[PDB]
């Protein structure tokens with residue numbers, strides 16, 4: 117198993133997300149959402165909020181355990197390793213984004229790391245604030261690289277359908293979509 121940098125993804129994006137059109141663009145969304153969904157499947161967090169931001173970026177927030185806030189080797193944050201080392205999901209999105217921010221909440225603290233220009237870290241994982249001890253979760257916001265995708269316009273209906281389906285499969289978890297470009301909004305939740 118050979119590890120690679122994010123440059124490898126950028127030179128061969130089709131190999132990881134299939135294409136660089138609308139389908140490939142939305143694959144980025146699926147990757148980030150599936151992480152939140154996987155966490156909820158394990159029973160952590162009961163709502164997953166997706167927001168299409170006005171600047172074109174997209175936000176996914178869950179209330180699971182939060183990504184690891186600890187250190188890897190050489191003082192490098194565990195989360196930075198996940199977002200910058202290709203084990204060939206998260207790193208792929210980061211590599212194909214002009215910028216990405218990840219915010220982690222756990223143990224009364226709120227941490228944040230920011231990446232730019234294809235996943236280059238411009239900060240470390242720094243504590244930016246505090247929260248209630250019970251509050252946990254992960255928030256990821258990314259701006260897809262316009263120099264890679266033929267379209268960077270997220271389609272509300274496409275994402276809405278995918279979240280609806282994810283909600284039906286999860287059960288007892290609320291999935292929401294909010295379009296800040298049009299003020300459109302919707303929520304999905306299926307009981308059992």
Ligand SMILES: Cc1cc(C)cc(-c2cc(NC(=O)[C@H]3COCCO3)[nH]n2)c1
Nearest residue numbers: 148151152155176180181182183206254
């Ligand atoms: C939106 C999004 C994006 C990413 C990369 C991870 C996650 C995420 C990851 C997790 N859970 C974890 O990372 C687990 C990993 O095992 C220790 C406890 O935390 N919940 N949510 C959510």
